[PDB]
Every structure is written in structure tokens, then in C-alpha cells.
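Bench log. Compound arrived from synthesis this morning; before running ITC I wanted a structural hypothesis for how protoporphyrin IX containing FE sits in the protein. Inputs:
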Amino acid sequence: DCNILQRLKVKMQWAKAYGFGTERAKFGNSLWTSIFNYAPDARDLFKSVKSEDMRSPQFKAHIARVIGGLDRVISMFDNEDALNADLEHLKSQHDPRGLDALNFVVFGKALFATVGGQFGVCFDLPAWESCYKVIAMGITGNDMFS
Amino acid sequence: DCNILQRLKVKMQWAKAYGFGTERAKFGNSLWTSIFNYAPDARDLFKSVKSEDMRSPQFKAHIARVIGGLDRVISMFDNEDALNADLEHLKSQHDPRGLDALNFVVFGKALFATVGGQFGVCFDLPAWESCYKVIAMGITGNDMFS
Amino acid sequence: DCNILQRLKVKMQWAKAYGFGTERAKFGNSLWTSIFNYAPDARDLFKSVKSEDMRSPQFKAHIARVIGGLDRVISMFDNEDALNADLEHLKSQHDPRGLDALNFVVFGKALFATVGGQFGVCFDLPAWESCYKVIAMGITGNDMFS
Amino acid sequence: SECGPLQRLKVKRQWAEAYGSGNGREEFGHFIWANVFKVAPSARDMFKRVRGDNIYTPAFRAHATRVLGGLDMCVALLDDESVLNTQLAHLASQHSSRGVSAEQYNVVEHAVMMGVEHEIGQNVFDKDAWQACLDVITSGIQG
Amino acid sequence: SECGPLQRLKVKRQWAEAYGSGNGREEFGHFIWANVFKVAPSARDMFKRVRGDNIYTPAFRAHATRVLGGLDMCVALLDDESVLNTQLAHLASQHSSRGVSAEQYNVVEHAVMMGVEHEIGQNVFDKDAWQACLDVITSGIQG
Amino acid sequence: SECGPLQRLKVKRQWAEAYGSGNGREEFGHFIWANVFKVAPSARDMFKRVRGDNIYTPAFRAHATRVLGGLDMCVALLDDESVLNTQLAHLASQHSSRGVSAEQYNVVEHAVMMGVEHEIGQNVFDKDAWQACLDVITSGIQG
Amino acid sequence: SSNSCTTEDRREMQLMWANVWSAQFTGRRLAIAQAVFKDLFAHVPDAVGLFDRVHGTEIDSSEFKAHCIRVVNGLDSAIGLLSDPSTLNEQLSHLATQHQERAGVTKGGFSAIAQSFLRVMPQVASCFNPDAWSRCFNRITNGMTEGLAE
Amino acid sequence: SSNSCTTEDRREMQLMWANVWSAQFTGRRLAIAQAVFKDLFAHVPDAVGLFDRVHGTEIDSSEFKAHCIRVVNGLDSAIGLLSDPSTLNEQLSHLATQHQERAGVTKGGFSAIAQSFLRVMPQVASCFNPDAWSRCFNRITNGMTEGLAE
Amino acid sequence: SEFCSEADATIVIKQWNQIYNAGIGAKSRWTMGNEIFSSLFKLKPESEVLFNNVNVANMSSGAFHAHTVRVLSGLDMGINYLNDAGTLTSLTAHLAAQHVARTGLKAVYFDAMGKVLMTVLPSLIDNFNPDAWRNCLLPLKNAIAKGLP
Amino acid sequence: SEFCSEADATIVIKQWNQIYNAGIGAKSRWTMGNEIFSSLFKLKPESEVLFNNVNVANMSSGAFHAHTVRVLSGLDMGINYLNDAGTLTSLTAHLAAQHVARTGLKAVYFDAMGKVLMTVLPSLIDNFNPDAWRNCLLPLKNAIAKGLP
Ligand code: HEM
Ligand code: HEM
Ligand code: HEM
Ligand code: HEM
Ligand code: HEM
Ligand code: HEM
Ligand code: HEM
Ligand code: HEM
Ligand code: HEM
Ligand code: HEM
Ligand SMILES: *[C@@H]1O[C@H](CO[C@@H]2O[C@@H](C)[C@@H](O)[C@@H](O)[C@@H]2O)[C@@H](O)[C@H](O)[C@H]1NC(C)=O
Ligand SMILES: *[C@@H]1O[C@H](CO[C@@H]2O[C@@H](C)[C@@H](O)[C@@H](O)[C@@H]2O)[C@@H](O)[C@H](O)[C@H]1NC(C)=O
Ligand SMILES: [Ca+2]
Ligand SMILES: [Ca+2]
Ligand SMILES: [Ca+2]
């Protein structure tokens, strides 16, 4: 799935919901709040970013880098060459950690709830689910995102 | 899944997002607009309800009975006997139609996008996923929603 | 009486007080309310327009045609040829009903109170009284409007 | 093309709107004369008495008031040819002594149409109805 | 000077802004054509069919819509020369029959730049990037 | 006619208003130069160093800042002839090398008056006081 | 209902269209443009034979890419001209007298491109209303379908 | 701190400057203009020797009066050009390439004129901020002090 | 039941009131009557014979003048009531009965009447909106011309 | 600790978002990557040799394309965080460690990088403000290029 029309629709819905400046920090804050509320045990996998307190600038920096990379991956949805080249780069960065692939599931559920509630009712969930599988498959490589 | 904790939060998230009076009619309109946008073939499955015109009083009557049936099933999430009694009565009404259960999957995607886009960022997508399958299974009788 | 200056003044005061669109319906409503409040017995002379309920579209249509013709008569105040030609036409329409000429008196009193209260204090009553006699004389023909 | 009765009606309402009620008339008058003397700077030589050197003088602004008011009369009577011919023939007598060139009428014709459209807006302006009817007004002043 | 890839990007965003979303397009279209026929009044003779006599006619406003929409396509594809050459060669075939003078392109070039800068503002307008890139568009239509 | 002491005072207050406080000066500068190069396109050839090709360049906008600031000094000292003659003679030395035509001063004269009246408004503009006093400023730069 | 293109839909159609279609975002046009004809060729098999000049057989050919953008850019003009119907009527007669000289252009062809647009738009445009879209899409096509055969 | 000329100071500097310096009030310029060079000549004794062309020895000479107004009118342009830094940079390079041809113009000379302005402004301008003033005054001078010696 | 949307109806009423209100001089009301009927009789010369009672042989007569105002007043009534569907349905039903009961009137007459208005009005109203008028007028035409051959 | 004033930071973020957001087509993001790096390699030809992993020998490659986005996404991250000094300090410290640990990178590279951006951006952004950018960028440059030879 994840055709070109869905890719372009995802970019327009992401760019609107993401915002710029102060809105980006508050956007990524609610997503990780959902991640820690959906999967409470995944919080202690980030002791290296001072995730004990979500307000710490070490975790605020971790939020910025993660959603920032998600912003740059979504921006390359149209072009496959650099998308896959970056998905592979993120793969070779996350694979050494050896993380559970079920967290990328929880990541999408939090992203859908965060983008959907911020974008509004016209949130295209099937398009976001289909195109999120492309991202998680490029990072995890796990068959879980077929 | 769909534990009683998830059952209670869905009700709170539903009652808030559903609204009262004019909000109910507009809520269902946004949902049914999302369904036909997700699956254009499904709009023809309601020729006996004037689905050709979504603002027709016969479809506005249909939208009302569907969102009302959902409203009363979600409200019975905490009592198995009454829920499963009405849920099987709804099966006895939908089985003579021979509907493709994949449409009920499309029905769930629009429901999440309409509640979440109205309830906001705190929308619990995993809990709504787990509990809609209870409703779908009791109506569809299909192993897909297991 | 009813010179050209009064005729032009009546048109400017009528056009302002009459309004356009929704205002016309509310204008003519208050006039017939005054007619039925000034002459209560004249209400049952309109059983053919469902005047039992003033909100009925049959009486709302009767209001529209009457004040609409009053609007078209006032518009032809300057030109005598078409004024008299239309006053005679309205005469040959009202004469078959054989109505009391004292109702056209009550009609003017309600018109003056309705235009006066809507136009404001600068309402020129003597000019409106003099030029209303021209209208009632053209319709009734009764010497009562000398 | 031709100044028919409908083209007259639309010109009247647009002139009344563009003319205003006396608040934007000084601006309306100054705007039109600046176009004439930009397109035809030699026309300044015909208005020496009203101080055509300077558009901003009250003496010339009085002349602009004169020509605007005179033009307002012809537009108001475009529907009524009987009295209109009387008014244009009246203006024809005063303007024949100046020896005004026929092209000079077409310059103020165009400038007035620029002035009107500047006041009402291009989306509502009707050049065909205005050009045809302004030709009628200038033709009567010329003969 | 040259229409580089950066000068393309800035022209695209400025055209989208100056073009609008259909609300100010009739004004955008009328504004540009008035400059052409003021600078080149003899160019009216080439647009007899769309009633080039009168800018305010819906038939000509449809022609202004045609040329604006056609110009919007070339600006949208200035980054992609492959399909851009196809679009300019397509426009080149239709405009060769008219026998349009090369100077006439430079007049509408200048008028469009006046129209754009009138919509976006002089403080943000880039004449160097616009002149270089509009020369590219007209050159393809000429050959 | 003549730049008397009263005509000086009115010009000063109108220039300060039209000049502004630095917010609308870039617009004030760009507006005046566009009139000059529209009326006299060959004058662009004299300002090659400041990139007179393109009005929107910061290098030329710096030149517009130079000439506007220099003109602001002469207006500020129109009442005081002693230091004014010093400032105009100072500007006369730099402008004699350019070989500027006397008509070219009258074009920027007219353009500045258009720029001022565009900023303050025609209802308050005084052409007689401005033309007489701007002739004084240009005469000192010429000799 | 009345099936007429209301002012409400005009606002609704223009607003959803202007956000998805703009002059700065190239490729966003082409993706929408290529998808419509792609949907048309599958449903209408004997339709590619009408676009041989633009090489409709080769969809990613630069000649069919240019045609795709020309078609929906003209649609963008019509949607933008919904605010000014007088200019719209004078323009719709131009496309009408332009399309019938192409032999094979039929009313059913414009009916198939309507279903082609009803499926493609909700995938790229959010808050897409099909009823409001179709009622004005039909209003446009019938002006292009003034003098041609069913 | 950062010592950079903030947008806040630009607003603050322009606003206090535009009220004290205007085109209608002659003499208000000259009093401010004469006082700065007067303060400079006292602190820098070997500085009048740099303004012999304008007769810097005779301060009330009409030739030094004209120079005074030219100097701070150019300062008025820079403060006004703080809103448009691109035009400001292109102009600051002009004054920079203009001042070094005058032999003896040094960075310390512009440092002495800075203290000359820090003392004169609060006596004529109310609500004068020295920090905000200096941070943008320095920003301007360093653009005039691109190619010259300390 | 429903005629046209409020926004479309709002466009029609405002542009109609611009050229037709009560304060207009009668001379402008006559220019409208003749121009519209002279154009109507050019499209349908067979329809001119029907206005015998209103002295149609001489359009400059006060009798025919007063007739054109009756028609325009009825049209002005319908336009200003476009927002009330209930009253407008009763109003359109009453004008139909008057025209159907009159002998010799076809439906093609009212259609040709529609094309006259759609052509006469653009030269009088600023930025005439043919769509919104076509959306609000053709319901009136069909409702008034309902039941006629 | 402090990078630039809110007003200066507000000017940078708004003008940066004008030319860089998520909804931009990838082709416009590639024009930016090459033009900036081709200009960088012209100022510093010795710095081109360092991007071996991202296939710098062919800038039209998806690998180098994806690299330029990483750099721009990190730059886009820093600009939109100019108002939060606490997070930005942690963010700048993390990018320094990545670049210092990489062998062969000098401080003059980042300075030449600064002059490329100060020259590339004026041809893309309307009314580019060099001062406010110089006030907000040079803190980022020195903080990212901190600890490098
Ligand atoms: C689309 C999804 C994701 C994207 C784009 C993403 C991106 C990133 C980025 C950009 C970094 C920092 C790279 C750097 O330091 O230069 C990072 C680090 C990290 N990510 Fe992800 N991430 C995603 C999902 C996840 C998920 C689901 C997990 C599950 C636990 C995860 C766990 C981590 C961890 C533990 C680090 C190390 C942070 C540190 O210690 O500095 N990420 N990721
Ligand atoms: C939780 C999900 C749903 C609920 C609670 C629900 C409820 C209802 C209700 C209350 C009625 C009307 C009962 C009556 O007439 O008395 C109805 C009718 C109907 N439903 Fe559903 N519905 C659901 C989803 C669906 C889906 C996914 C489809 C197929 C795509 C569907 C197809 C139909 C059809 C075709 C009718 C006949 C309506 C008529 O002709 O009157 N329903 N449903
Ligand atoms: C200036 C004063 C009046 C004017 C202009 C006027 C006008 C009209 C008009 C236009 C009609 C309908 C014509 C049609 O059906 O085509 C009408 C009907 C009628 N009018 Fe009047 N009218 C006036 C005063 C009065 C008065 C004072 C009475 C006293 C009772 C009256 C009683 C009636 C009645 C009973 C009908 C019959 C309505 C029906 O059954 O359809 N009118 N008039
Ligand atoms: C549209 C046509 C015109 C109208 C309605 C008009 C109106 C007037 C009026 C009302 C006056 C005042 C006469 C008086 O009170 O003695 C006047 C004066 C004058 N008009 Fe016109 N004018 C028109 C066209 C022109 C044109 C085209 C020219 C020359 C290009 C012209 C040249 C003059 C001159 C020379 C005077 C007398 C100047 C003076 O009093 O010093 N007029 N005009
Ligand atoms: C910037 C370059 C131009 C563009 C994008 C452009 C665009 C167009 C378009 C799209 C048409 C519609 C053709 C059709 O549908 O048959 C057209 C027609 C035409 N253009 Fe242009 N045009 C341009 C330059 C010019 C210039 C500079 C001239 C002459 C000065 C010119 C003269 C014409 C003529 C004579 C027609 C046909 C007129 C008619 O249909 O009656 N074009 N133009
Ligand atoms: C109102 C009278 C004028 C004033 C106050 C004025 C002011 C100035 C000033 C302050 C400069 C800067 C000189 C420098 O820093 O070296 C300048 C430069 C110049 N002016 Fe003028 N100017 C005036 C009239 C003119 C006119 C009318 C022309 C020609 C039409 C002209 C041509 C030039 C040229 C060629 C330069 C130098 C261009 C360059 O630097 O590349 N000036 N002007
Ligand atoms: C309503 C949506 C449509 C729009 C807006 C539209 C618009 C256009 C435009 C702008 C052109 C090119 C005009 C030019 O070259 O100057 C064109 C060409 C053409 N159109 Fe359409 N069109 C539409 C639907 C259709 C449909 C449904 C057909 C069915 C066959 C069709 C058949 C053609 C053909 C055969 C050409 C000529 C291709 C060529 O030049 O090689 N169009 N259309
Ligand atoms: C930052 C504040 C200053 C500004 C805004 C400024 C500006 C100016 C201006 C506008 C001129 C005349 C340009 C012309 O004639 O076209 C000038 C001349 C000059 N300036 Fe400055 N200046 C400043 C500070 C200084 C300082 C601190 C010195 C120290 C020596 C200096 C030395 C000179 C000299 C020697 C001349 C030439 C005088 C002459 O022409 O006889 N300036 N300056
Ligand atoms: C929107 C279109 C029309 C409207 C609103 C309208 C309305 C009216 C009205 C208000 C009257 C006066 C009724 C009375 O006397 O009480 C009338 C009379 C009449 N109308 Fe119409 N009319 C329309 C079109 C037409 C057309 C197209 C024809 C014929 C081709 C026609 C033929 C007549 C005739 C023959 C009369 C009666 C004349 C008489 O009484 O002497 N009307 N109409
Ligand atoms: C504001 C300026 C810069 C920013 C914001 C920046 C940011 C980044 C980012 C986000 C990455 C990706 C880190 C990752 O893969 O997780 C990166 C990698 C890299 N950067 Fe920079 N960078 C800048 C300037 C430079 C300069 C000037 C140079 C060298 C002259 C440079 C050399 C490199 C190299 C060699 C890599 C790693 C390439 C690879 O992984 O194959 N960067 N930078
Ligand atoms: C048309 O009729 C005109 C009659 O004049 C008008 O009608 C009579 C009843 C009077 O009221 C009068 O004041 C009106 O103005 C004639 O004057 C005219 O010549 C006739 N036209 C033709 C061609 O016969
Ligand atoms: C530069 O590299 C180009 C390769 O094309 C791109 O990279 C490969 C891996 C594919 O993903 C392809 O789809 C990409 O577009 C060459 O086409 C090009 O000739 C190379 N340039 C030079 C000068 O060698
Ligand atoms: Ca003429
Ligand atoms: Ca060229
Ligand atoms: Ca002079």
C-alpha cells in the first residue's frame, strides 16, 4: 500500500499537525506521553536521555531528534531512493540497540492519536497506517509491518 | 482484550466526543463522510436509504440509527449479558444482508478518526481498537475481529 | 393634495421603512397585526387566505401580494397614467368582493403607524394621509376619500 | 457600442456611486485631471485662468467642481433626450469659443472612465456602455 | 541574470502567492493586461477574437484566465526542464501562427513582473530572478 | 513661484511627514526612483555602479538611501541659507563630475513631488511651494 | 435535491482545492493529474486510443505528463472561476467548442472521468465532500458538454 | 551577554531617535551634531587635525556645521536602516570604503566617538538606554570599520 | 419544496434590490418594461397578441406600463421571498393558477422569458451572477409555469 | 546559555519555515542540498573528501540526498528551538559530540558553511534579515562547532 496520493496526503496532514516553533515541542510531548501511557514499560528504555523526568532538556532533546527525523522521513515520502537510504540509515542506528519491534507498533498508535487529535476529524487513518508500515519496516526490518 | 478499564475510558471518550443535540447529527455526518471516502464502493450498499444524497432526510435518519446503535452498544460495555444480548440481536438484523465484513473494518477506521479528531490528542486508540472488535465480532460473527 | 414633492417624499419614506428580503415579510406582518387589532371584525373577511392563523403560508402569501401591490402603487406615484391605470385595475379586482370602504380607512391608520414607527420620528403624516387618499379613491372609488 | 436605454441606466447608477456625496469629490476631481495633463500636458495651456499650472489650487479645484457638476447633469438626463439636448447645446455654446480639439474630448473621455473605474472598481465597470454614452455627451458639446 | 535552480524556487513561491486561490485572479488578470495595452496599444489588434477592445468583458477575462493558467504551468515546471520544454514547445506551436513580435513578449514580460510585484510587494520582489526566468519561458515559446 | 520663508516652513513639515521614521523609507525610496526610470529610462545608464538595472537590490536601495538622506539635509536647512549654500555647493562638487543634464534634475524634481504627494496626500500637497523650493535645491547643485 | 452547484459548494470546493493544488508545490499536481487518467484508462479501455497524440499509452512519457497537467490546470481555472460565473460561462463555451473537434469525445467519457475524480480526490484531499464536489463538477462538465454526443 | 544588536534595541533605538531627530525641527539636529564633535575634540586632542578640510578648528564655521549635520544624518540613515539589514550591510560597506581613504581614521577614533555619543544622548533624549544604544551603535561602526586600523 | 440555497438566494436578492426598489423614478421602471417585453416579443412574436387588455399595441400607454409593473412587482415579490420556502411555494402556486386559467399561454413563453432576463439584467447589474440567478430563477419559472402547455 | 532574543528568534523561525516545512516536494529539498554543498565544496574542496559514506562522489544519489536532509532536519530542528534555551543547549551539545568524534573536520569548515547559508538563503527567502540570522545562527555554529580543531 502507501501509494503516492496517500504519501502526499500524509505530508499535508503531518505538516499541518506538526506546526513550527513552539508547536513542535508541544506536539512531540503529547506523542511520547501517549507512548508512555500506552506502553508504560517502554519508559525505562530511555534512561540515557534522562527520561525519569519528561521536562528535562535531555528528554526534550530526545523528543526533538525523534520527531524531527520523523518529519524528515515523511518529507521524503515521495522519493523512494532517499527514503530507503534514510530508512536504512535509521535501521543501522536502531539495530545496535536491539529493540522490541512491538514498540514501533505502540509508536504508530501514539502518532495516529496525536496527529489525529491535532489535525481533526478529517484524519485519514488508513492512509497513515499503510504509510507508517513503510517507515517501521525500513527501520526495524521486522516482518511485523507487512 | 478490552478490559473493563478500557471499557470505561471508551465511554468517557465517547460521551465527550459524541456530544448532544446538534453535535450527534454532525458527528455521524463526519463519520459517514469518512467511510465513503475510505471505501467509495460502500456508498452503493445503502441505495435503499438514499445514500445518493448524504443530506437527504432518509440518510440523515439512517445516520441517526447507526450512531444511536453504536451509542447504546458502547454504553453496555460494562454488562456482558445485556451487551451480548443486543449485540447478537444486531447480528440477527445484519446477517440477512450478507454484508462483507471488510466494511466493518472500514467502519472502525472512520470511528477512530471521528472520535479522536473530536476528543483531541488524549484519544486512546489502542483501547478503542480492542473494544471495537468486541462490537464487530458480535455483529459480524467473523473470526477476523478476534 | 398629494403634490409631487409629497409623492417623492412618500416613496423615500416607504422604501426605507419597507426594506428588502426578510424585512418586507416582517413589515407587512406588523401592518396586518395592526389591522386586526384596530378592526378585529375584518379578520374573518379573509377566510379564503387561511387568516385563522397569521403564520400560515396562505396568509403570508396574502400579506406579500397586498403590500407588494402597495409597493408598486407607491412606485408609480410620480406618473399619473400608469398609477390610475393600476388603481383602476385594483378597483375592478376589489369591487367584485364588495368590501366596506371603512376598512381602507383602517388600512391607512395601520400603514401610518407601521411606516411611522419603522421610519422614525421624521415620518411625514400629513403627506402620507393626503397621498393615501389618492390610493383608496383609486381602488374603492368611494367619495369617503375626498 | 451604442448608448441604449439600458446602458444609460447602468451609467447613471455607477456615476452616482463614483461621484459620491461630496466627501470624495475633491479626490475624484483631482484624480481625473491628473490623467488628462499626464496624457496631454499641452492641454494645461487651455486652462490658464483657473491656474491649470497647479492642480492643487482651490481655484482649479473649483474648475474641477464646475466640469464635474456639469458632467453630472448630462449623465442625470441621459434617459431624457429632450432636456439633455438642451443641456449639451448649452455646454456646446461655451466650449465652441475655446476651440477645443475633438481629440481633447476623447482624452477627458478616457480620463473620466479611468476616474470612474478607479472609484467603483474594474470588476463592475462597463467600458462598452461608458464609451458609447460618453461619446454621446461629447458629441452634443461639439455639434 | 541566469535562471538558476534557486531563482526558480523563489519565483515559484512568489507566483503562487501573487496568483492567489481564485479570489484575486480576476483582478490579477485585469491588472496585467491593462499595462500591456497601455504600453503597447497596438497589441489590442492581435486579440480581436477575445474582444481585446474591452478588458472588462467576460470573454476577454476568459482569455486572461487562459494566459494566466498557461503561464502558471510553466512556472510550476521551471524546476523540471524535461516536461517544461514539452509545455513551452506546446505553447510555441500555437503562438507561431499569430506571428507575435519578440518585443511583444518583453512587454508582457515586464507587465507580468509589474503584476506580480503589485501583488506581493516591492520589498520582496526579485527582478533579477524574475527577468532571467521569464526570458526562459518566452524563449521556449519563440523557439 | 518663489521659495519664500513660509513656503520653506510648509515644505519642511511635509517632507518630515513623507520621509517618515525609517519604516516607510524603503518604500519611499523605491517609489521615487521608479518614476524617474519610467519617465527617463536612459537615466539608468548613469547609475551603473549601484546596479541601476534593478531597483530592488540592497546596493541600489543604499543609493536611494544616500540621495534621500542628502535631500533631507537640504530641506532641513532651507531656512538657513548660510549652511544651505555650503551643503548644496558640497553636493555640487560631486555631481559635476557625472555631467548630469539639467533636465535630469527636473525629472527627479517631479518624481520627488510625486513621491511626497503620494505619501502625504493630494489634498494637503502644495505644488507651488514645492516646485519653487525644489528649483532652489537643484540650482545650487548645478551652480 | 436541486443538484445545482450552490455557492456553499463553490466555497467548499475552492477551499479544499486551493490547499491541495497550488503553484509552489510541483509534483503534487502531477501525482493527482496522472492518477485520474490512470483510473480512466482502466475503467474505459477504448479511451487511451483518444490520447495517442500525447502518448497516452506511455503514462510516464513527458508528453502525457504535460497533457495531464494541462487538463487539471484547466480544471483549476474553472474551480477558481466559480466565483465569477460570467467569465466561467464564456470560458466553458471555449472548452466545449474545443473538445468536440476531437472525434470520440463523448458525454459518457466525461461521466467516466467524474467517477475517476470521485475516487481520487478523497485519497489526496482531506475534508473532501463528494456531493458538493460532484454537483459543481457536473455543473462544469455540462458547460463543456454543450455540443457533443452522449 | 551576547552584545549583539537585538531587534528589541532596534525598535528602542529607532523610536527614541526618531522623536529627537526629525526633518521639520532644524537646529535640533545641529545642537546634537555640534556637541558630539565638541566632546570628541576635547577627549582626542590630535583629532581636529583630521577635520581641517571642514575647518574643524572653527566649530561654528558654516563649513564645520555642514559636516556635523552630514555625519549624524548618515547615522540617522543607519538607525533607520536597522529595520532592513540587507540594505544596511550594503550601505555600511560604502561608508567603510569611504572612511579609510581619509588617512588617520582609526578604530580607536570610532571608539572615542562612541563614548562621545554615550554622554551626549541622555542630555537631549529622554528614556535613553545606553546598553541598547551601544550594542547597535557598535554593530554599525564595525560595519564602517571593516577595513581600517585600530 | 426548496428553491435555492441561502447564499445563492442572498446573492439574488441583493443584486435585484440594487436595480429595483420603491424609490426609483417611474421612468426607469418603464425603460425596463419595454426593453424586456420588446425583446420577449422578438423571441416570441406569437406571444405579443395575448396582452390585448393592457393595450399592448402601444407600449407607451399607461395601461401597458401598469401591466409591466404588475409583472415586475410579482417578480420582485418572489425574489425577496427566496429565503422563505413555505410562503414562496404558496406564492408560486397562486401565480400559476392565474396564468394557466388564462387561455393561449405556453411553457415555451416562460422559457423564452427566462432567456430575456438572463440577457437583459447583465447590462444593468454590476457583476451579474448567472449561476446563482439560474439556481434561484428556474425554480420560480418552473413553479410559475407549472401546468401550462 | 542564551542564543538570541525572542524577536530575533521569531524572525528566523518564520523566514525559515517559509522555505522549509514538511509539505515541500522532495525535488525542492534536493535543489537545496546540492546548491549548498556544491558551494561549500567550492569554498572548501578539501572538505568534499569526508562524505565518503554518503556517496558524495555522486550528489544525485539517494544516499547523499538522504544525508543532506539529515543535515537540514537537524538545522530545521535547531531553528524551531531557538526560543527554548535549555533544550537547544542540550541539542547543540549532542551534535558537537557527533562531529568532534568524526575524524578530519575543522572549525573553518563550519565557518565557511556559515557564509554559504548567509549567501544561499537570500535568493530563496523574501526580505532576508542578515542581522537577526547572524544573531541566531552564529550561536548555533559555535555551539555545534565547539571542540573542533
Ligand atoms: C519513526 C520512528 C522513529 C524515528 C524516526 C526515530 C529516530 C531516532 C533518532 C533521530 C534518534 C537519535 C539519533 C542521534 O542521536 O543522532 C533516535 C534514538 C533512539 N531511539 Fe528512535 N526513532 C523512532 C522510533 C523509536 C522507537 C519505537 C523506539 C523504541 C524504544 C526508539 C528508541 C530509541 C532509543 C533508545 C534511542 C537512543 C537515544 C539516545 O540514547 O541518545 N526509537 N531515534
Ligand atoms: C457498530 C457498527 C454498526 C451498528 C451498531 C449498526 C446499526 C444499525 C442499525 C441500528 C440499523 C437500523 C435498524 C432498524 O432499521 O431498526 C442498521 C441498518 C443497516 N446497516 Fe448497520 N450498523 C453498523 C455498521 C454497519 C456496516 C459496517 C454496514 C455495511 C457496510 C451496515 C449496513 C447496514 C445496512 C445496509 C442497514 C439497512 C438500513 C435500512 O435499509 O433501513 N451497518 N444498522
Ligand atoms: C392599498 C390597499 C390595498 C392594496 C394595494 C391591495 C391589493 C391586493 C392584492 C394585490 C390582492 C391579490 C391580487 C391577486 O390575487 O392577484 C388583494 C386581494 C384581496 N384584498 Fe386587497 N389590497 C388593499 C387593501 C385591502 C383592504 C382594505 C381590504 C379590506 C378587507 C382588502 C381585501 C382583500 C381581499 C378579501 C382579497 C382576496 C384575497 C384572496 O382571497 O385571494 N384589501 N388585494
Ligand atoms: C465632457 C465635456 C466637458 C464638460 C461637461 C465641461 C464642463 C465645463 C464647465 C461647466 C465649464 C465652466 C464654464 C463657465 O462657467 O464659464 C468649463 C470650462 C472650460 N472648459 Fe470644459 N468641459 C468639458 C470638456 C472640455 C474639454 C475636453 C476641454 C479641452 C480639452 C475643455 C475646456 C474648457 C475651457 C478652456 C474652459 C474655461 C476655462 C476657464 O474658465 O478658464 N472643456 N468646462
Ligand atoms: C508569456 C507568454 C504567453 C503565454 C503563456 C500565452 C498563453 C496563451 C494561451 C494559453 C492562449 C490560448 C490559446 C488557445 O486556447 O487557442 C493564448 C492565446 C493567444 N495569445 Fe498568448 N500567451 C503568451 C504570450 C503572448 C504574447 C506576448 C502575445 C502577443 C503580444 C500573444 C498572443 C496571443 C494571441 C493572438 C492568442 C489567440 C487570441 C485569440 O484566441 O483570439 N500571446 N495565449
Ligand atoms: C535632488 C538632487 C540630488 C541629490 C540630493 C543627490 C544625492 C546624491 C548623493 C548623496 C549621492 C552619493 C554620492 C557619493 O556618496 O559619492 C549621489 C550619487 C549620484 N548621483 Fe545624485 N543626487 C541628486 C541628483 C542627481 C541627479 C538628477 C542625477 C542624474 C539624473 C544624479 C546622479 C548621480 C550619480 C551618477 C551618482 C553616483 C552614482 C554611483 O555612486 O554609482 N544625482 N547623489
Ligand atoms: C472536465 C475535465 C476536463 C478538463 C478540465 C479538460 C481540459 C483539457 C485541456 C486544458 C486540454 C488541452 C487544451 C490545449 O491543448 O490547449 C484538453 C485536451 C483534450 N481533452 Fe480534455 N479535459 C477534461 C476532460 C476530458 C475528457 C473526459 C475527455 C474524454 C475523451 C477529454 C478529451 C480530450 C482530448 C482528446 C484532448 C486533446 C489531447 C491532445 O491535444 O493531444 N477531456 N482537455
Ligand atoms: C559612526 C559615526 C560616523 C558617521 C555616521 C560618519 C559619517 C560621515 C559622513 C556622512 C561623512 C561625509 C560623507 C560625504 O562627504 O559624502 C563623513 C566624513 C568624514 N568622516 Fe565620518 N562618520 C562617523 C564617524 C567618524 C569618526 C569617528 C571619524 C574619526 C576620524 C570620522 C572621520 C571622517 C573624516 C576625516 C571625514 C571627511 C571630512 C571631509 O570631507 O572634510 N568619521 N563621515
Ligand atoms: C417570471 C415571469 C412572470 C411573472 C412573475 C408574471 C406575473 C404576472 C402578474 C403579477 C400579473 C398580474 C396579475 C393580476 O392582474 O392580478 C400577470 C398577468 C399576466 N401575465 Fe404574467 N408574469 C410572468 C410572465 C408572463 C409571460 C411569459 C406571459 C406570456 C407570454 C405572461 C402573460 C400574462 C398575461 C396575458 C396577464 C394578464 C394581462 C391582463 O390582465 O390584461 N406572463 N403576470
Ligand atoms: C549547521 C551546520 C551542520 C549541521 C546542523 C549538521 C548536522 C548533521 C546531522 C544531523 C548529521 C547526521 C547525524 C546522523 O547520521 O545521525 C550530520 C552528519 C555529518 N556531518 Fe554535519 N552538520 C553541519 C555541518 C557540517 C559540516 C560543515 C561538515 C564538514 C565540513 C559536516 C560533516 C558531517 C559528516 C562527515 C557527517 C556524517 C556522514 C555520515 O554519517 O556518513 N557537517 N551532520
Ligand atoms: C402611443 O400612445 C401615446 C399615448 O400617450 C399616452 O397615453 C394617453 C392615454 C395619455 O395618458 C398620454 O398622456 C400618455 O402619454 C401616443 O402619444 C403615441 O403617439 C402612441 N404611439 C403610437 C406609435 O401610436
Ligand atoms: C549519479 O548517479 C545516478 C544514479 O541514479 C540514482 O541512484 C541509483 C542508485 C538509483 O536509485 C537511481 O534511481 C537514482 O536516480 C546516475 O544516473 C548518474 O549518471 C550519476 N552521475 C554521474 C555523473 O555519474
Ligand atoms: Ca468619443
Ligand atoms: Ca526577454
Ligand atoms: Ca527646476
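What the model suggests: The radius of gyration of chain I is 15 Å. The helical segments of chain I are 6-19, 26-43, 62-80, 85-101, 107-120, 130-144.
ITC booked for Thursday regardless.
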